[PDB]
C-alpha cells in the first residue's frame, strides 16, 4: 500500500499468466504492479548509497592572515630576507621603499623590503572520489494485503541491489516471493563525478570542474594542520608611495562556488556513506512465485462499517477502510461498484486484489483500493441486507 | 629639509624679486622651492581629512539562519501559516506537499506547507556620506635652515587649509613668514563619493554603485539590532519530491564586493574622521615676508670635518653633514664646488641657501645640499689651509 498518496505514482499491468514485468523505479516515484490472479504489489526505490569514498582534495574558500612581519635593507645592501620565507604557512613579497639619512641609511635610494604574513583557512570544501562498484540501492515492497493505514513482515519487504548482486528475491510470507533482476550499472554514471562537501551540504559535481577551481588547496591525505598550495589565490600585496607595503586577504569566495553549483545534484551524508535522493533503477520483476494468500477464504457474512469517509487519490482511485463486526475471519470481503443497485452488476475494478479480513477477533479493520468508472456509481461493501454503500462520482 | 630622500620630489624656482610661486602639492610628493635671496623651503601635503561623515546605509554580505520552523495543512484545509511570518527577522516561503491517510489527513492531495527561518547578519559593510565643506588639508613646511638630519619650531611649521579658510600664513621665526593661497574646492570632487567601510578597511566609492548593490541592507540610523530589507537577496528555499522544503543561505558575497572595489581609492580612519593618502592641492605661495635668517653672520674660521660620507640623492643633488670645531658661531659656512682647486672658481650651485653654523658651542653639526655640475668637481668646505674636500662625479 505504500504508493497510496504518492503523487508520482505509476500503474503497471502485467499480462495474465505472464512471468516478467518491466519497471522503472525512481527516487520520488512509486510503482503499483497488478496482474490477474496475483496480489497487487507496490515497489519503490527509497535510497541510493555510495560507500567507501576516498578524500581527493580540499579547497580553501575563506582565509585569514596574522603575525605580519617585515625585513628591510638600505640601498646597495642587497635584498631583504625574513626567515618566515622558509615557512610554508607564510606568504611573502618584496618591493622597494625610499631610504636615506632620515631613516637610518648611509646612502639615498631604493631599499629592499619584504613582508610576510601567516595564512590560515577559515572555511574549506572537500572533494571525495566515487567507485561505481560501491553503489547500493534499497527497494521497499508493500503488498496490497488488505492491511489498513497505520498498522503498528509479511506485507512488507526490503531488498538491496548492488552492481555485484543485481538479482534479489524478496519473500512475502503467505504471498510467496517476488524476483527482481535489475540493471544497477546502467543509469547515473559515477565515472566522472566527485562528491563535494561544503558547510555540511553536499553535491555531486564533475571532476573537470573540481580540478580547475582557482583556490588554495590541500591534499586529500593531508590531515591535521593543512599545507596549502596556491595560497596566492586568496592573498594580495599592496604598496603605497615607496613608503610601505601591506598584505590583504581576498574575501570569501563562498558565493561564487554556490553560484557554480546551481546546476548540480544534491546529496546527504549517512556517517561515512553518501546518500542520494535522485536517480533511478530499471528492473525486471519475476512473478512466477507470487501467490494470493487469501484466495481460499470463505466469504465474510457479518456487517461492515465505514470507519473513514472513502477518499479519492490524485489518480482517481478510491480508498476504503472498514470495520468488521464478525468472528468468522479470516474471510473474503464482498466489495464491488455498481451502477444498478438491483443488478449489482460489477463496474470498474479493484486495485487491491482479493480484499480480505484477516483476524478472527471482532471489530478488526481492513483497507482496499478501487478504480471507479467515470461518472456515477455505488461502492458496495458486504452482502445482503446489511451491506453498506457510498455513492461515488468520478470526474 | 623634509624633501631630502623623497623620490617624488619636485624643484620649483621662483623669479628673482618675485612675489608669488605656483605649486602643486600631492600626497606622496614633496616640493623644494628656491628663489634668489630667500631661504629654500620644502613644502608637502601630509594628510587630507574628511570630518563629520553621516552613516548612509549598511549592506549584509554574509548571513546565517537559525530556528527554522514549519506549519502544514491538509488538502482543502487552506493555506498554512506560522506566526513567525509576522516577525521581520524571519524569512518564509510556501509550497505544497503530498498528504493522505498515511500522514494524518482525511483527504488525499496537495497540502499547504510554510517554512520560516530567522535571518542574522554575520558581516556587513557601511557607507557614509561626505560634505565637501568638511575637508581639511595639512601642509608641512621645513626650511633648509642648515639643521642636520635627526635633530631632536623655527625650521618647521604646520599649516591647515580648509574650503572656508583657503589662505594661511606660516611663521618661520627668524626666516619671517610664508603665505599660502590654495584652491581646496578644486581637485578631488566629493560630490558623488561615499565612504565605504568593510572589515576595518576603507574606500571611496561612487554613490551610483553603492545604491545598486544587490544585498540586504539596513538604514543608516538603524542602531542596535538591525532590521534587514531585501533578506531574500541572500536566502533561498528548495523543495524535494512533494515531501519537504528547506531554507539555505547563499554564501558570503565578500569576494564579489572586493572584486568590484579594484578600481577605487583606498582610505583610513582616524577615530570618526576619514584620512585619505591620495589627492592634491594647488597653492600659490607668497614670498614677500620670507627672509634669510643668517645673511648677516660672519664667516666661520675654524676647521670643519665630514661626519658622514657625502651622499647622492635620487635627483643628483648631494647632502653634506659637517662638524665644526670652532666657537665663533653663529657663522656662515664657506661651501662651494670647484673644478680648479687653485682658482676656487664656483661651479654648480647650492640648494641650501646661506649654509650656517648656529650654535656657539664647539663640535656642533650642520647639513647642506648641493647641485653639482655634470662630470668631476670638488666639494670644498671651509677656508684656507684647513679646508676639507671631497671629489665628486655626477653622471
Amino acid at each position, epitope marked *: 500500500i505504500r504508493c497510496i498518496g504518492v503523487s508520482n505514482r505509476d500503474f503497471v499491468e502485467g499480462m495474465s499468466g505472464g512471468t516478467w514485468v518491466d519497471v522503472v523505479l525512481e527516487h520520488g516515484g512509486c510503482v503499483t504492479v497488478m496482474a490477474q490472479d496475483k496480489p497487487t504489489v507496490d515497489i519503490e526505490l527509497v535510497t541510493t548509497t555510495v560507500s567507501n569514498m576516498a578524500e581527493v582534495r580540499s579547497y580553501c574558500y575563506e582565509a585569514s592572515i596574522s603575525d605580519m612581519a*617585515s625585513d*628591510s635593507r638600505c640601498p646597495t645592501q642587497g635584498e631583504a630576507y625574513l626567515d618566515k620565507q622558509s615557512d610554508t604557512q607564510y606568504v611573502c613579497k618584496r618591493t622597494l621603499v625610499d631610504r636615506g639619512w632620515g631613516n*637610518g641609511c648611509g646612502l639615498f635610494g631604493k631599499g629592499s623590503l619584504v613582508t610576510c604574513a601567516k595564512f590560515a583557512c577559515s572555511k574549506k570544501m572537500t572533494g571525495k572520489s566515487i567507485q561505481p562498484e560501491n553503489l547500493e540501492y534499497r527497494i521497499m515492497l508493500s503488498v496490497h494485503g488488505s492491511q489498513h493505514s497505520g498498522m503498528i513482515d509479511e506485507n512488507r519487504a526490503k531488498v538491496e541491489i548492488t552492481p555485484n548482486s543485481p538479482r534479489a528475491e524478496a519473500t512475502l510470507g503467505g504471498f510467496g516471493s517476488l524476483g527482481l533482476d535489475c540493471e544497477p550499472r546502467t543509469g547515473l554514471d559515477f565515472s566522472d563525478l566527485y562528491y563535494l562537501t561544503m558547510n555540511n551540504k553536499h553535491w555531486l559535481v564533475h571532476k573537470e570542474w573540481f580540478h580547475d577551481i582557482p583556490l588554495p588547496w590541500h591534499a586529500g591525505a593531508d590531515t591535521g594542520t593543512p599545507h596549502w598550495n596556491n595560497k596566492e589565490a586568496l592573498v594580495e600585496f599592496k604598496d603605497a608611495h615607496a*613608503k610601505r607595503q601591506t598584505v590583504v586577504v581576498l574575501g570569501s569566495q563562498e558565493g561564487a562556488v554556490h553560484t557554480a553549483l546551481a546546476g548540480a545534484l544534491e546529496a546527504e551524508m549517512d556517517g561515512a556513506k553518501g546518500r542520494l535522493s535522485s536517480g533511478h533503477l530499471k528492473c525486471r520483476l519475476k512473478m512466477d512465485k507470487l501467490r494470493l494468500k487469501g484466495v481460499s477464504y470463505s466469504l465474510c457474512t457479518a456487517a461492515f462499517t465505514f470507519t473513514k469517509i472513502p477518499a479519492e487519490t490524485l489518480h482517481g482511485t478510491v480508498t476504503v477502510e472498514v470495520q468488521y463486526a464478525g468472528t468468522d475471519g479470516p474471510c473474503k470481503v464482498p466489495a464491488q461498484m455498481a451502477v444498478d443497485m438491483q443488478t449489482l452488476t460489477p463496474v470498474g475494478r479493484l486495485i487491491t486484489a482479493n480484499p480480505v479480513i484477516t483476524e478472527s477477533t471482532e471489530n478488526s479493520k481492513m483497507m482496499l483500493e478501487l478504480d471507479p468508472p467515470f461518472g456515477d456509481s455505488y461502492i458496495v461493501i458486504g452482502v445482503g441486507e446489511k451491506k453498506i454503500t457510498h455513492h461515488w462520482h468520478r470526474s | 629639509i623634509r624633501c631630502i630622500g623623497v623620490s617624488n620630489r619636485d624643484f620649483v624656482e621662483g623669479m628673482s624679486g618675485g612675489t608669488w610661486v605656483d605649486v602643486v602639492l600631492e600626497h606622496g610628493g614633496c616640493v623644494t622651492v628656491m628663489a634668489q635671496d630667500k631661504p629654500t623651503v620644502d613644502i608637502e601635503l*601630509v*594628510t587630507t581629512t574628511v570630518s563629520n561623515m553621516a552613516e548612509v546605509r549598511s549592506y549584509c554580505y554574509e548571513a546565517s539562519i537559525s530556528d527554522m520552523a514549519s506549519d502544514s495543512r491538509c488538502p482543502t484545509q487552506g493555506e498554512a501559516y506560522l506566526d513567525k511570518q509576522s516577525d521581520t527577522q524571519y524569512v518564509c516561503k510556501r509550497t505544497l506537499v503530498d498528504r493522505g491517510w498515511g500522514n494524518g489527513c482525511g483527504l488525499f492531495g496537495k497540502g499547504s506547507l510554510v517554512t520560516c527561518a530567522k535571518f542574522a547578519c554575520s558581516k556587513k559593510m557601511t557607507g557614509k556620506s561626505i560634505q565637501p565643506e568638511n575637508l581639511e588639508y595639512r601642509i608641512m613646511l621645513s626650511v633648509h635652515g642648515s639643521q642636520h638630519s635627526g635633530m631632536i619650531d623655527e625650521n618647521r611649521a604646520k599649516v591647515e587649509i580648509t574650503p572656508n579658510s583657503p589662505r594661511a600664513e606660516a611663521t618661520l621665526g627668524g626666516f619671517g613668514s610664508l603665505g599660502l593661497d590654495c584652491e581646496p574646492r578644486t581637485g578631488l570632487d566629493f560630490s558623488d563619493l561615499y565612504y565605504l567601510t568593510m572589515n576595518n578597511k576603507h574606500w571611496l566609492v561612487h554613490k551610483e554603485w553603492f545604491h545598486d548593490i544587490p544585498l540586504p541592507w539596513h538604514a543608516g540610523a538603524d542602531t542596535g539590532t538591525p532590521h534587514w530589507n531585501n533578506k531574500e537577496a541572500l536566502v533561498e528555499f528548495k523543495d524535494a519530491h512533494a515531501k519537504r522544503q528547506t531554507v539555505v543561505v547563499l554564501g558570503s558575497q565578500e569576494g564579489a564586493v572586493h572584486t568590484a572595489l579594484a578600481g577605487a581609492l583606498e582610505a583610513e580612519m*582616524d577615530g570618526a574622521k576619514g584620512r585619505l593618502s591620495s589627492g592634491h592641492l594647488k597653492c600659490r605661495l607668497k614670498m614677500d615676508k620670507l627672509r634669510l635668517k643668517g645673511v648677516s653672520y660672519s664667516l666661520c674660521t675654524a676647521a670643519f670635518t665630514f661626519t658622514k660620507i657625502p651622499a647622492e640623492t635620487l635627483h643628483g643633488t648631494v647632502t653634506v653633514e659637517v662638524q665644526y670645531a670652532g666657537t665663533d658661531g653663529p657663522c656662515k659656512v664657506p661651501a662651494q664646488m670647484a673644478v680648479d682647486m687653485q682658482t676656487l672658481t664656483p661651479v654648480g650651485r647650492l640648494i641650501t641657501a646661506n649654509p650656517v653654523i648656529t650654535e656657539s658651542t664647539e*663640535n656642533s653639526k650642520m647639513m647642506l645640499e648641493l647641485d653639482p655640475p655634470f662630470g668631476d668637481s670638488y666639494i670644498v668646505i671651509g677656508v684656507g689651509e684647513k679646508k676639507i674636500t671631497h671629489h665628486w662625479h655626477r653622471s
Partner: antibody
Amino acid sequence: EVQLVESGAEVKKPGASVKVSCKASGYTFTSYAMHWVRQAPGQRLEWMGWINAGNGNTKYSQKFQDRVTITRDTSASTAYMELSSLRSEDTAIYYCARDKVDDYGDYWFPTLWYFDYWGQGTLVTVSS
Amino acid sequence: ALTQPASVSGSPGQSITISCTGTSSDVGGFNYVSWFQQHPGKAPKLMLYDVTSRPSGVSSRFSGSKSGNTASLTISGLQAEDEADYYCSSHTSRGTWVFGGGTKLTVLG
C-alpha cells in the same frame, strides 16, 4: 617639561599577569610611540615592544608575542603593558620610553633619536 | 645580540673607548646606533644617537664612530661622574631593537 611616570612595584605569582601603566606629560601623547624595555636585576636591557599612541597599532618582540598586550588610553595620556603567564624569568624593572611617529601618523621607521625620554621604571617580582 | 666588553676603566683625565659589535642586520646595516648611560638606581639616559650625534646638553667629551659591524663610544677627559653602565643599541632590519650586554665604566680612584 617632558615626564613619563610609571606605576609602583608589584609582586605576582607565576602563571598570573601584570599590567603596568606609564603616564606621559609635557608632550602631545598621540604624536609618539611608547616602547617597553625591561631589565632583569644585574642584567642588560631587553626591548619588549611598542604601541603607536595615535592609531593604536602595536609591534611585539617574538619572544613576547603571545604573552604581551600593549594598549593606550588617549584621554588619560597613558600607555599600558600587560604580561601574562608569568614565569620566574620575568622578575625585572619595566621601563617605558618614547619615540616620535612621522607626520603621516605612521611608525614604520623610528626617528634617529629614539628613547630620548625614559620612565622611572617599575619593579615586578614573580614569586609564589 | 650586540657584544660589548664587560668592563672598561681609565684614570681621570684620560680617554677610553667602548666597542659594540653587531651584524649586517643591525649595527653594520643602519645608522640607528645609540649609546645610553645608566647610573645605579636610575633609568637609562640617551648619550649618543645616529652614530655620532649628541642630544643638546650632553658634553662633547662623548663621541661616537662606526666601522663595519662595530660601533664605538669614546669618552675623553674622564671624570668620576662618568662612572656608570653604558649600553649600545640598534634598530634592526626586522624593525626590532637590540641592546648590548652593557659595559661597566670605572674611573680609577
